[PDB]
Amino acid sequence: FVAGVQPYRKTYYEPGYEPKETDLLCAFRIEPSPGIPLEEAAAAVAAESSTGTWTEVWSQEMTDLHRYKGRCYAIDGNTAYIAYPLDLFEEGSIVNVMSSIVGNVFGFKAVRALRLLDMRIPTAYLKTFPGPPTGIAQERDRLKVYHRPLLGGTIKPKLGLGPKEFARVVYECLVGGLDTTKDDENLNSQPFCRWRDRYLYVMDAVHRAEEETGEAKGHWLNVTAGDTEEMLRRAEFAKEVGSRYIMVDFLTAGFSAYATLRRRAEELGLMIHCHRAMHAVFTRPKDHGIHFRVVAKWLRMAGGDHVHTGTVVGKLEGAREEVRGIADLLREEFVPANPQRGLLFDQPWAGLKPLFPVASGGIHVWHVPDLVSIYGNDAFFLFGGGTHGHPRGSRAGARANRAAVEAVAAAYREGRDILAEGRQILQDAARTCPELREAMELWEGVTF
Amino acid sequence: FVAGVQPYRKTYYEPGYEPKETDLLCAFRIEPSPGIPLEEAAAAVAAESSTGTWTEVWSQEMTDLHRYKGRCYAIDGNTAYIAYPLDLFEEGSIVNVMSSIVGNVFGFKAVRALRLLDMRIPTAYLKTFPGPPTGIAQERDRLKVYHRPLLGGTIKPKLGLGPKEFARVVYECLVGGLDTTKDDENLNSQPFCRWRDRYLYVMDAVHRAEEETGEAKGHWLNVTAGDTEEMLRRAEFAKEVGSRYIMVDFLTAGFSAYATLRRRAEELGLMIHCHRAMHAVFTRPKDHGIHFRVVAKWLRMAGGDHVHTGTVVGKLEGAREEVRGIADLLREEFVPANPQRGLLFDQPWAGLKPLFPVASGGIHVWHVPDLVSIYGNDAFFLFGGGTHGHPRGSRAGARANRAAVEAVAAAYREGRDILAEGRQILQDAARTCPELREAMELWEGVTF
Amino acid sequence: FVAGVQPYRKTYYEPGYEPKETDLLCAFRIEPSPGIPLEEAAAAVAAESSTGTWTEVWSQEMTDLHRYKGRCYAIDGNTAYIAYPLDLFEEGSIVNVMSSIVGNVFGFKAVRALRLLDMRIPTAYLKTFPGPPTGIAQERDRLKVYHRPLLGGTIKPKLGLGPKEFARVVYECLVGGLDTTKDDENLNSQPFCRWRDRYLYVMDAVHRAEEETGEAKGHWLNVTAGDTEEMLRRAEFAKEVGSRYIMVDFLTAGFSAYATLRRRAEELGLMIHCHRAMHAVFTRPKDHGIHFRVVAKWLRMAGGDHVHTGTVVGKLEGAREEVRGIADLLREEFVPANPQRGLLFDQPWAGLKPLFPVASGGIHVWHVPDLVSIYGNDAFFLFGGGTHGHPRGSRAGARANRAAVEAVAAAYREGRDILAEGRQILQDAARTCPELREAMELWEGVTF
Amino acid sequence: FVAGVQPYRKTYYEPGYEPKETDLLCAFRIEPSPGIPLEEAAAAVAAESSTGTWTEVWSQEMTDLHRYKGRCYAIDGNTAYIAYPLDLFEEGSIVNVMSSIVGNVFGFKAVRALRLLDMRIPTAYLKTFPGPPTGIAQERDRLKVYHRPLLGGTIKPKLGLGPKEFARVVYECLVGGLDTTKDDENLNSQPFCRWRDRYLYVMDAVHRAEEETGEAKGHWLNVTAGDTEEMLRRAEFAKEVGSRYIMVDFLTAGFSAYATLRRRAEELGLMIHCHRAMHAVFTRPKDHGIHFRVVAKWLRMAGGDHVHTGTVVGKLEGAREEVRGIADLLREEFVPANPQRGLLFDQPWAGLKPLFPVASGGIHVWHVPDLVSIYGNDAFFLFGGGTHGHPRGSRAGARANRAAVEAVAAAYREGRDILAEGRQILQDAARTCPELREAMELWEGVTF
Ligand SMILES: O=C(O)[C@@](O)(COP(=O)(O)O)[C@H](O)[C@H](O)COP(=O)(O)O
Ligand SMILES: O=C(O)[C@@](O)(COP(=O)(O)O)[C@H](O)[C@H](O)COP(=O)(O)O
Ligand SMILES: O=C(O)[C@@](O)(COP(=O)(O)O)[C@H](O)[C@H](O)COP(=O)(O)O
Ligand SMILES: O=C(O)[C@@](O)(COP(=O)(O)O)[C@H](O)[C@H](O)COP(=O)(O)O
Ligand SMILES: [Mg+2]
Ligand SMILES: [Mg+2]
Ligand SMILES: [Mg+2]
Ligand SMILES: [Mg+2]
């Protein structure tokens, strides 16, 4: 054992290494600090994510470093590909994967910037995860909604509504045509609206809407809480009050608490909506953080029934091709690499169930064509402000959104170029839907 | 109710608003997108973090918006200060605070970049949190270590060591002079080292070291797991095998799972080490994300006994003044605003216990003076590679680090300018500590 | 440290002290013993309620006395105002507040008499309490009773009725027009009427009355018992038999047992009626004890849905202005100081839900105007003897009371001076309600 | 059934009634309001405590009123004796007894003032209660202290001491000669001293003192909390940390929570100290409230091992003869009526165990004779300020108090008139105890 500092690339840079089908592959966009070669930066990332530290240690003689070390096996431009042995990762733990890959390498002075673009989860590691508990087909059967994007909407204002008024808005939206509604990610339990009262009032509203309309309706009750036990108690109550849906902010709540909640919800027969609050703090920058496709893969492994993926045309940033790739990752059993969409690895899913992409944020009727072009039919379209911001109220807005979604889905099923004929399709739908006409007039030139 | 899109600043920009002592204040560095005024961007952040959406909603007539809305009450340069009413936040839930403040505002197209710099947690909201379960004084009493920084070290290599070899390294480090040791953040339970076997072997080593040295020793067993129940089971086993310490990756595991684990550990009498793995994905960029001082405040509220804060002179990025401010936040009962250190608010702590800052990452004996200058005595100095990378082994490295820390702490207590006389202090210590001399020679010019 | 007895005012009398918004303020009417100055008495009260004892102790050198001590910061007449630091009180514990403020200072020879008039609970301490689980609006929604005082009545005789006869009286009262009924505070479980049989028979009667009338009906089943576990079991059974209401004697049972019961009832979805039995042993005297406004604040913090507040015109002592102040404390989100009503502090409620004042005790139809003047619509009017003492039976008495309450509430909503036109309103109601006429004739000159 | 208001004395005043051995007898000092005869006031008290209301009710025809009604069977001066049938009271429930006897009769306008002086608990009702779990003899055997009053002391200052300093004071007191120590009634769990840390540190101190002195030592850890479950958890922890003692504020916490805690402590083998905080709010006034002898009877029924009874010569009000009567009630198996001591009934105890009277509050060495005269040997003498206020510290004060207690107990056992020779006995003890001499000099003229 030779004590002292040695370059990482001496051991953790293996350009000739051929990744094994069982290896976990990570793509890192690296901006090294001045004086640090890109190869050295990639080797440092691999070493400090898998086995290495800043200096040689005698203890390395007590284990097979070459069997366990992560190594950079390729560098294309600024993108370094690193392979990690399967044995490095705890089975069925997204937490361990994050602590390894994105644990400390992002804070190293040697790298000015570091972004995790894509991850290749091996089938062997995937088999250790449960996947979504319900799936797209089972959810559609539960809601009896087919050949159409599923409509929804966040109840607004985000905060300040009492349980009675909140449930009144929920009932208006559901009777107006929305398939589901949801609590806002920040609405968990507050003095103005405690979670028990909100659950009771909202489920009364949901049952009334189901009886009146005759269609399956639900509300994504937010069980997010400051402790896992409270989240489990809230999910149990949601099941008690008759809810078929719950929602959780898995990133803020955490992947461990989310795994516990997913197990409990599968036991309870509840569908889990996954809100990605706080993702943009590390998914937005193009030079640093984690691309949301990786988070989508992690969530699919952890077992979400729906997850937010982006609107592209909405108020929140999102790239069209990246969103298409994320939707394919969430919905397909095998996603081949697509450099245009940012997918740098062929990603099998080992039979893990698909989940619903959710489009939410500053989307109104005029955005329905584009959304259907991006997502097709197997997706959730959430209209919060587009529903309640209708001049005639939430019921009219829900009716307008339902009409627009149905018309665009019918055109898409017919093979029409919805991207080019979207305005005509919406106008034709509005000819018989005054609510749709009013919504189109109100938000004609509203763009982000 | 007037349907349509209105500027956020019309309602959510209130420059004349005077924050209440009960309000929660957030400072945001905002880089607005072209064509978006800074006032409009700040108002959008406040609205979409508290109550507002992209368009007016009739439901606003059902609640007092001005009582609940968050508003930007000041804009200095690119830093906008936003006040949130206390009633907006669920009691004792960091998850709700994150879902509100950093939920969706970071992904808005209107803002090119958004960074949460500082947060003013009101005393009323602080009283709803438990705080650290042990505290600095109680931990020192348990370890019987006073008037000296507490030594530690991550066992290396990060992965690949079996339980027997891992415990052998632990025993060598503890007998050499380290007060504690820890599992690496990515070492939870793997085929090469399962958590049960590691716990048993490591606690045997810790007990042997305690018997031989006669001083209190511990190992920060990592209970991080993919589910909260597994983490609780691992903490219970750690207590069963006689460990007085556990560690968890609270960010990757989550704040809800962390709160559950903290409650269970306080019940079990275990001290919790908090590893901030994955923080750099959103704390490093200067234009986007969350500054780690906010995360430190959140962790202190959630009840960590120690938390990593930075080395400044180590291998991971960290600013000296920011680290000093974070240490004051973690250790003081009241931290006045300090623009030099980035503290933009006076932060009371409502009697919440202080916790130990931890300095780890590419630090060896030569960095001990600076560290003591930055942190003083109430801190943990972690030497992973500095211990095992010693030429004569982990025991010699631990002895050298203990000697350096003791000498520098003695000089600091004597009022000497350790920053200027650090090399002389280390040389004088090495005159009687050959291990310290060897460590100094090996890493003389090693800088980051 | 100087051993020996020193005057309290030397340390615990700080006239220049400015109370902090986080401090807990107590107003004490003090009658000092001969030879004891009022300042000395107030200082003694503060010292022996917060930190001090009868003589100096060396241990005071081990803590910051000035940071933790309670101090008298003002003396107006015989009323001394004492400020206690927030850190002195355990979070979410009325028991600790009582043990501090009213623990031992009332038995001191130095003070001939001591009465706790008002307390200023800070918002920070309030946020640590749950508040009422249901609230006025939610309770009205559950009962579907709006714009009207809610009618009720204690079943009489207090004791000696079997479950069958008790339930028969309950059914007659509920079908006659009473919204709810209740067990007497002393009727818990006795050989003549065991609690299980009473619960079963009473819930059968309540369900029959609900079916016949078509209006929501309930009975405040008394779960008060000699142990907390028995109270929890009785509440669970009450939920099992379909009751939406339970009642407990929180003072006799205790605030700790009451807190446990409130948690369990919120879990069970039960509304809790709070009976203030044994309050008059320390709330009646004008020179000694605790004013009931303080107990009302404590109960609102502890989370009662309704609490008895007084009748003024009934058989039990009560001041009109004090009762108005107590009602405002129980029902308002912020109660400004009102010397006329005895409110010496501005009392925020930090979003804690309001609860229902209950007027009970020697009140018949003729007292309905005054009651509505005192309480308005958001209150419960309990007619025990006024219902069963009707010549034609409990059903006729309930009908008469309902008619009187409805007529007076309609007049009040119309802006009529119910205090001056109450007799005319009752006569006009009786023109179409023979039961009301009989009740008015029977109790025309019955006054207390 | 004749509807209308009738005088109470017509039915509830039965001067010729002969109380049955199974009846529960209450003595009430009554000050009737002007125009209300004393007989009418006593009848009203009986009626509204047992079965009656303000007017006749038809439901009385459904039960045997004369079998269940409470009746005033004698009026001597202003003291009315009322008999209540045994069947009126729930078995083993002090809460029900309080809700009946002292429920609402104290707030009646008909009575200007009402005080419950004494109660005759029948043997049949007593057999339904558990009594103290340990008893005087068992406690003495556990402590191995015989033929001597047991010494103790409240740790001062009441609040503001941390766990380490608190335990240091505890250790000094215990090693100095105190048999036990206790937390103050208001010290439960606070930011400055959390209950877990206090329990751990205090039990370490207690074990160290036991090892050093060789005598049994204990600390009355305060388990009082805002909920019964928290109190049970704290008692369980106290047992876990090795404590043989716990203390609870039974009045503030409540008799139901106290009964639950007593059951759990008997299961755990813990001795319960009963603090009577808040008693003086209703036991001090001579014209209104409840005399503490009744509360002492209730506590003995509920099963306390020790209870505070008064000092007479201390800082808190207390009558010598009343305190002697209370001590006899707590310690004797049968207490005959004693008008001089205020005992108006012969009180059997049906084999219920005796408990320890506790003398606390402004008592120093000079008060030891009087105390021994009042209580004898079977009592606890608590010196809070008398221990820590010693010039040389808590250890010296504890030594002085132990010396004084031992000397006075030896003189009492010898038949000496300790009341007349107390100063000589203390001086003779001080001839060989410099700490006692210093304590006597410091507090020579300190009187209350
Ligand atoms: O808070 C909001 O902004 C929303 O309720 C949308 O409301 P509106 O429909 O009224 O705009 C959604 O949570 C987001 O759009 C963010 O989802 P994500 O970023 O995960 O796509
Ligand atoms: O994995 C590592 O790099 C370490 O074990 C250090 O090992 P060495 O001492 O051998 O360098 C620590 O986890 C970090 O330094 C990160 O802590 P943080 O970023 O929270 O400060
Ligand atoms: O026992 C009673 O006297 C009552 O049932 C009233 O019966 P009636 O309606 O037949 O008089 C009520 O408990 C009280 O009036 C006391 O309530 P509070 O003192 O809390 O106001
Ligand atoms: O707080 C106090 O005053 C004490 O700790 C005494 O301290 P000192 O010995 O230092 O005076 C005791 O609780 C009381 O005397 C009241 O007991 P009670 O009224 O039940 O007799
Ligand atoms: Mg949302
Ligand atoms: Mg590490
Ligand atoms: Mg009653
Ligand atoms: Mg005390």
The four Cα atoms C90, C96, C100, C105 give a dihedral, to 10 degrees, of: 180
CA–CA min distance C194, chain D (Å):
9
Buried b (16+ CB within 10 A) or exposed e, C125-153: bbbbbbbbbbbbbbbbbbbebeebbbbbb
Q: Which two three-digit tokens encode residue C15?
A: 């006239």
Characterise B362 by phi-psi region: left (phi > 0), alpha (psi -120 to 50), beta (else): left
Q: Which two tokens stand for residue B447?
A: 């800088």
Q: How far apart are CA D332 and CA D353, in angstroms?
A: 9
CB contact (8 A) between residue A62 and residue B361: no
Q: Which of C408, C413, C399 is nearest to C367 (CA)?
A: C408
Rounded alpha-carbon distances, angstroms, from residue B20 to A275, B83, C334, C373? 31, 8, 16, 36
Q: What is the Cα–Cα distance from D194 to D234, expressed in whole angstroms?
A: 11
What's the CA gap between A240 and C311, in Å, rounded? 41
CA D300, chain centre distance (Å): 8
φ, ψ at A388 (rounded to 5°): -75, -20
**β-sheet bridge partners, residue C24:** C84
Q: Alpha-carbon distance B247 to C351, whole Å?
A: 37
Q: Measuring CA to CA, how many Å separate C409 from each of A163, C308, C311?
A: 27, 20, 17
Note whether C touches B: 3 CB pairs or more under 8 A. yes
Region of residue B361 (phi > 0: left; psi between -120 and 50: alpha; otherwise: beta): left
- Does the annotation count B275 as an active-site position? yes
The SS3 of residue C289 is: strand
Q: Would strands B245-249 and B271-275 be described as parallel, antiparallel, or unpaired?
A: parallel
Task: Please state whether beta strands A347-348 and A334-335 pair in parallel, antiparallel, or not at all (unpaired).
Answer: antiparallel
DSSP calls for A34-72: TT--HHHHHHHHHHHHHT--SS--GGGGGS-HHHH--EE
Structure solved using which method? cryo-EM
Which secondary structure element, helix H or strand E, spans residue A198, and what is its range? helix A195-213
Question: Please, where are the H alpha helices in B76-185?
Answer: 94-101, 123-126, 136-143, 163-176
Q: How far apart are CA D174 and CA D205, in angstroms?
A: 9
Closest-approaching ligand to the CA atom of B309 = 2
Collect all residues with Cβ–Cβ distance below 8 Å to D3 and sequence separation of at least 6: C389, C390, C391, C442, D55, D56, D58
Is A226 in contact with B92 (Cβ distance < 8 A)?
yes
Q: Count the residues in chain A.
A: 448
Alpha helices in A341-382 (DSSP H): 368-375
Q: Could you tell me if A140 and A272 are in contact, meaning their C-beta atoms sit under 8 angstroms apart?
A: no
Q: Contact D243/D221 with Cβ under 8 angstroms?
A: yes
Nearest by Cα to A448 from A311, A322, A352, A330: A311
Residue C189 — φ and ψ, nearest 5°? Answer: -160, 115
Neighbours of C419 (CB within 10 A): 11
B261: its two tokens: 């684990």
**What DSSP state is assigned to residue B91?**
T
One-letter amino acid for residue A380 of the chain:
F
The residues, ordered by sequence, that sit 6+ positions from C182 with a Cβ below 8 Å of its Cβ are C152, C153, C154, C155, C219, C220, C222, C245, C247, C273, C382
Angle of helix D292-302 relative to helix D255-268, nearest 10 degrees? 40
Q: What is the longest distance spanned by two Cα atoms in chain D?
A: 81
Alpha-carbon span C190 to C225, nearest angstrom = 11
| D111-120 and D150-152 beta bridge pairing | unpaired
Helix (H, G, I), strand (E, B) or coil at A221: strand
- Give the separation between CA C431 and CA C426, rounded to whole angstroms: 9
Quick one: CA torsion of A263, A264, A267, A271, rounded to 10 degrees? Answer: -90
Q: How far is CA D271 from CA D129, D268, D305, in A?
A: 17, 9, 6
- Residue C18: how many CB atoms within 10 A of its CB? 8
Contact predicate B386/B443, CB 8 Å: yes
What is the CB neighbour count within 10 angstroms for residue D138? 14
- Going C67 to C72 to C74 to C79, the CA torsion angle's sign is positive
CA distances from B38 to B27, B76, C182, C429, D218 (A): 14, 10, 61, 65, 66
Q: At what angle do helices C228-240 and D255-268 cross, to 10 degrees?
A: 110
CA distance C323 to A48: 70
- Which atom of ligand 4 lies closest to the CA of D277? 20
Whether C and D touch (3+ CB pairs < 8 Å), yes or no: yes
Whole-number Å distance between alpha carbons of D163 and D155: 12
Write the CB contacts of A441 (distance below 8 Å, at least 6 apart in sequence): none
Closest CA to D228 of C261, C301, C256: C256
CB atoms within 10 A of CB A152: 29
Contact B262, B94 (CB under 8 A): no
Q: The tokens of B308 are what?
A: 């990593």
The string of DSSP codes covering D14-75 is: -TT----TTSEEEEEEEEEPTT--HHHHHHHHHHHHHT--SS--GGGGGS-HHHH--EEEEE
**Cα–Cα nearest to B192, from B224, B158, B161:** B161
Q: Does B133 touch chain D (CB under 8 A)?
A: yes
Residue type, D65: L
Q: What single letter denotes the amino acid at residue C28?
A: F
Interface membership of C86 toward B (CB under 8 Å):
yes
Handedness of CA D251, D255, D257, D259 (dihedral sign): positive
Phi then psi for residue D180, to 5 deg, are -145, 170
d(CA B290, CA B279): 9
CA A240, CA A249: separation in Å to the nearest integer?
21
CA–CA dist D101, D78 (Å, integer): 18
Strand residues in C11-110 grouped as ranges (E): 24-32, 71-76, 79-84
The Cα B443–Cα B432 span in angstroms is 19
- The tokens for D447 are 């009187």
Tokens, residue D404:
């004084």
Q: What is the DSSP string of D100-123?
A: HHTSSGGGBTTEEEEEEEEEE--H
User: Which residues, other chains included, contact C320 with Cβ-Cβ below 8 Å and sequence gap of 6+?
Assistant: C312, C374
C154, β-bridge pairs: C182
Residue given tokens 């005789």 in the structure block: C157
Chain length of chain D: 448
Judged by CB atoms closer than 8 Å, whether chains meet at D162 and B352 is answered as no
Query: For residue A170, with 0-12 CB atoms within 10 Å meaning exposed, 13-18 middle and 19 or more buried, which class applies?
Result: buried
> What is d(CA A252, CA C111) in angstroms, rounded to the nearest whole number?
56
Q: Report d(CA C57, CA D390) in Å as an integer.
A: 7
Alpha-carbon distance of A354 to A363, in angstroms, equals 24
Alpha carbon distance A409, B130 (integer Å): 52
The residue behind tokens 């107390």 is D422
Q: Residue D254: which region, alpha, beta or left (left: phi > 0; alpha: psi -120 to 50)?
A: left
Q: How many CB atoms lie within 10 A of CB B321?
A: 15
Q: Which atom of ligand 3 is nearest to the CA of D54?
A: 11
Distance of alpha carbon A146 from its chain centroid, rounded? Answer: 22
Q: Record the tokens describing residue A357, joined without a space.
A: 């992409």
DSSP-based three-state secondary structure for A354 = coil
| Catalytic residue flag (residue B315) | no
Residue entry with tokens 């160290």? D208
Please tell me the distance from the alpha carbon of residue A185 to that of residue C436, in angstroms, as a whole number. 54
C420 C-beta neighbours (distance < 10 Å), count: 10
CB D425 within 8 A of CB D411: yes
Q: Residue A134, exposed/middle/buried by CB under 10 A (0-12, 13-18, 19+)?
A: buried
Cis peptide before D149 (omega within 30 of 0): no
SS3 of residue D334 by DSSP: strand
Half-sphere exposure of A320 toward its Cβ, with a 13 Å CA cutoff?
A: 6
DSSP state at residue C43: H
The token pair that represents C185 in the structure block: 């505070």
What distance in Å separates the CA atoms of residue A193 and residue A204, rounded to the nearest whole number? 16
> Maximum CA pair distance of chain B?
81
Q: Which amino acid is at C34?
A: P
Resolution (A): 2.2
Torsion of CA A257, C269, C96, C18, to 10 degrees: 90
Q: Which residues pair with C348 in a beta bridge?
A: C334
Taking an 8 Å cut-off on Cβ atoms, the answer to whether C86 and B350 are in contact is yes
H/E stretch holding A245: strand A245-249
- Lookup result for tokens 């690895």: A345
Contacting residues for C236 by C-beta, under 8 A, at least 6 apart: C264, C268
Q: Pick from C133, C137, C353: which is nearest to A164 by CB? A: C137
> CA C114, CA C71: separation in Å to the nearest integer?
16
Report the distance separating Cα B84 and Cα C179, nearest Å.
41
Strands of D134-264, DSSP E: 150-152, 180-182, 218-222, 245-249
* A196 contact partners, CB below 8 Å, separation of at least 6: A237, C133, C266, C269
**A306-308 and A356-360 beta bridge pairing:** parallel
Q: Angle CA(B373)–CA(B377)–CA(B383) in degrees, nearest 5?
A: 80
D197 reaches B (C-beta below 8 A): yes
Structure tokens at B390: 């010693």
Alpha-helix runs per DSSP H in B59-106:
65-68, 94-101
CB neighbourhood size of C291 (10 A): 23
Backbone angles phi, psi at D135, to 5 degrees: 90, 165
Closest CA to B327 of B311, B313, B345, B346: B311
Ligand 2 atom at shortest distance from the alpha carbon of B280:
19
User: Could you write out the DSSP letters of every residue in D256-273?
Assistant: HHHHHHHHHHHHHT-EEE
What distance in Å separates the CA atoms of residue D273 and residue D221, rounded to the nearest whole number? 9
Q: d(Cα A146, Cα A321) in Å, to the nearest integer?
A: 25
Cα(C42) to ligand 3 centroid in Å equals 36
First to last CA, chain A: 60
What values do phi and psi take at D383, rounded to 5? -120, 95
Residue with tokens 């305190």: D323
Contact C281, C314 (CB under 8 A): no
- d(Cα C66, Cα D245) in Å, to the nearest integer? 32
Q: Is C351 on the interface with A (CB under 8 A)?
A: yes
Ligand 6 centroid vs A116 CA: distance in angstroms?
Answer: 19
Q: Give the sign of the dihedral formed by CA D168, CA D173, CA D177, CA D183.
A: negative
Q: Is B424 on the interface with A (CB under 8 A)?
A: no
Residue C360: count other Cβ atoms within 10 Å of its Cβ: 24
**Could you tell me which residues come within 8 angstroms of residue D256 by beta carbon, excluding any fewer than 6 positions away?**
C224, C225, C226, C227, C228, C230, C231, C253, C254, C257, D95, D228
Phi-psi category of residue A437: left, alpha or beta, with phi > 0 → left and psi -120 to 50 → alpha: alpha
Other beta carbons within 10 angstroms of residue C408's beta carbon come to 27
